[PDB]
Amino acid sequence: SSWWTHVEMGPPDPILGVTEAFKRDTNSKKMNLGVGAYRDDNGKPYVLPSVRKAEAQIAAKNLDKEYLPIGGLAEFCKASAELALGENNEVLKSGRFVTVQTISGTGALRVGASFLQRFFKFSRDVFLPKPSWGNHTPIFRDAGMQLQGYRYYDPKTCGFDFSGALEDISKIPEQSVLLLHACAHNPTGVDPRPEQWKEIASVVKKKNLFAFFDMAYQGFASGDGDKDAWAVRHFIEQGINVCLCQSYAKNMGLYGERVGAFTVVCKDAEEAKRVESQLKILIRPLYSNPPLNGARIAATILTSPDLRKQWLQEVKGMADRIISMRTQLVSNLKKEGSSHNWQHITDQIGMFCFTGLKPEQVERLTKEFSVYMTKDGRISVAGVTSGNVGYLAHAIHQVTK
Amino acid sequence: SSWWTHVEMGPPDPILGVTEAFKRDTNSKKMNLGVGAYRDDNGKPYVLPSVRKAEAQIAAKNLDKEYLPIGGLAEFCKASAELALGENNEVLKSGRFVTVQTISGTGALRVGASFLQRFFKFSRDVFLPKPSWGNHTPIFRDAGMQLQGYRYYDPKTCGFDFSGALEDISKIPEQSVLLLHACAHNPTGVDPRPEQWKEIASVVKKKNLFAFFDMAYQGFASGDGDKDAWAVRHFIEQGINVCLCQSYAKNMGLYGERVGAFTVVCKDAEEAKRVESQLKILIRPLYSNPPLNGARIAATILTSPDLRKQWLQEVKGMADRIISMRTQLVSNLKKEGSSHNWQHITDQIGMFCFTGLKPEQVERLTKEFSVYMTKDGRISVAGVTSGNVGYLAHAIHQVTK
């Protein structure tokens, strides 16, 4: 026998399957709407020009490759809090926060979760929206927390079920943890409006809930970094000491370089030093310390007012191409004669959209049309191009007419 | 009235204390023997030329920054296994193994610990040498395992307590996990000679123990990749399906790029698939996927027969320099006429060295001599240079005459 005779084959990764089925398809019309990363108008990976600039300008300094501190590159950390909280945020001025570099936004979720596990004595329950990023569940579980949920997605309108959310949130046991997507909710693309965000905050504050924000799309979401981070900022301003996860995968296109941060906002700088030392104690035994490249690229962009300003324009480009595809898809559905309401497609934010398609319809799109998407009807808008958007709208109309 | 009021400040980092005491030291004969990375003869970081070269071919290639698969970059993984086992190994030829890319050697250790915790149903117990790398303890603890020790260092001889190790390993409950440093034990520098490894291997095989190899210094240790990974290879050859953490922090000076691998040797190719699915399921909720840049570097080096030969030479150069500092620090101690035996300094391997020094002679070495090193008598041979070896020889004689 053997050590691992009893280790079972894991279940198939659904998203990868869709992707591999797409690659094997000879149909010349086929489309990949399961890709989980930005594509430009010809369906190609897109390394931002500002990232290329920063990179050339880094190779020029003949930098070493030594270990960073456990919390990573100090200037990346500080810039990254500024990115999120904004320039003169009182949190920044009073120093009442700590930020650590992590292994993209997944590492920040994991680091944050492990910190809740050890120090958040008030609860073991993390409430996730229905639905949420599929990884959220295994990260908190493996970290040693428990998952619950709150009503978010409205299947009846393909929008925000505000009344359900607010009812659920206002019943969460006091001092539980609430997880909130800061904007561009993955997988649905559905976000509360400023006005609704306000009332969630007021409940969170009133019931004394701990707020945990996942922010993987600042700037990429709408092209506007300040709008996108508005809810995190507002919770902080109603005096809610959030913690926060940032990713630079999508808004700088650094996907495989793994650049993100985790930030806890505290009562004062003293409490932040304490959380900091304990954050470092949790990081050292996961990976000792974080990687150099992507944090240098990112630090260089954020601290150089020209590169920064150039980077923001590139981000607006990306958000705009996405918004354009949403708008086009919709108007093409009108052109094709569909009588269904499609406005969700444009109210939603970011690169993911719940189309509203049922599983049987998804099978038709794939079999009859070679449109590839997950069975929950989520499309990756990044796979839509001005070149394929007419075909798409025809296929969607066909299977729903 | 705050979430974290009860979160305590962490203990101080002994080493840092020491590093930063050094930098305050104002005498200019001062030495930092507590530095955890390779330094060259002028005490400076060292990017290897083959690394600069590889980086260059890569920048020329103009590649994207898209996500790696959960397992990481295939060619780096395949090349990584070949480094460790030697190509032409029966393991690689039958495909009975899985190698995944991880966040350097720490991440490999944490990933394998999590694997153990979840699928090693025979035991919670993980046996570390006395002493082992400091981070081994919290890595295994946070992952959910228990720690034991077995005798390894022998303060009477500053060598390997062979017969203690054997007696201890013999009394390990069957089907426990045994962690073995592959070459260049850290912190002592003490290794078993081959014939002694032969004897640990046949006990491990007789008492049905699971052999967990931590190999952070292949090549770096002695300057011969094959001699360094001999012990690992011998275990496998004897029928022990070990698992294995690789680091490239020290042998390619990729410290902050975080390039590592975790390899489980298996009974056959089928088992390796099953073990692979589950490693994927474990990695995904820690950090999703691993960083690109260092893996790209290492695969470029390892797959070009030209760069690979060149890199091995520079590796051989690092190992010889360290060896050279050891031999001269022994030479000089005899020429200062000390009467204590110091064969241990040249018998030891790699860049850490247990001197024999008691904590009082270490204090004297700081106060009276500006030689900084930890209280346990560990020196980093890398902070020793041909400029300062004479001084250190002298100082060490002064405190031990």
UniProtKB/Swiss-Prot annotation, chains A, B:
Catalyzes the irreversible transamination of the L-tryptophan metabolite L-kynurenine to form kynurenic acid (KA). As a member of the malate-aspartate shuttle, it has a key role in the intracellular NAD(H) redox balance. Is important for metabolite exchange between mitochondria and cytosol, and for amino acid metabolism. Facilitates cellular uptake of long-chain free fatty acids. This is Aspartate aminotransferase, mitochondrial. It is found in: Mitochondrion matrix; Cell membrane. Belongs to the class-I pyridoxal-phosphate-dependent aminotransferase family. The modification N6-succinyllysine is found at residues 44, 61, 78, 93, 130, 156, 198, 267, 280, 309, 334, 367, 375. PROSITE patterns: AA_TRANSFER_CLASS_1. Keywords: Acetylation, Aminotransferase, Cell membrane, Lipid transport, Membrane, Methylation, Mitochondrion, Nitration, Phosphoprotein, Pyridoxal phosphate, Transferase, Transit peptide, Transport. Its EC number is 2.6.1.1, 2.6.1.7. It is an enzyme of class 2 (transferase). The lineage of its organism: Eukaryota, Metazoa, Chordata, Craniata, Vertebrata. It catalyses: L-aspartate + 2-oxoglutarate = oxaloacetate + L-glutamate; L-kynurenine + 2-oxoglutarate = kynurenate + L-glutamate + H2O. Acetylation of Lys-267, Lys-316 and Lys-334 is observed in liver mitochondria from fasted mice but not from fed mice. The modification N6-acetyllysine is found at residues 30, 44, 53, 61, 78, 93, 130, 156, 205, 250, 267, 273, 280, 309, 316, 334-335, 358, 367, 375. In eukaryotes there are cytoplasmic, mitochondrial and chloroplastic isozymes. Pfam families: Aminotran_1_2.
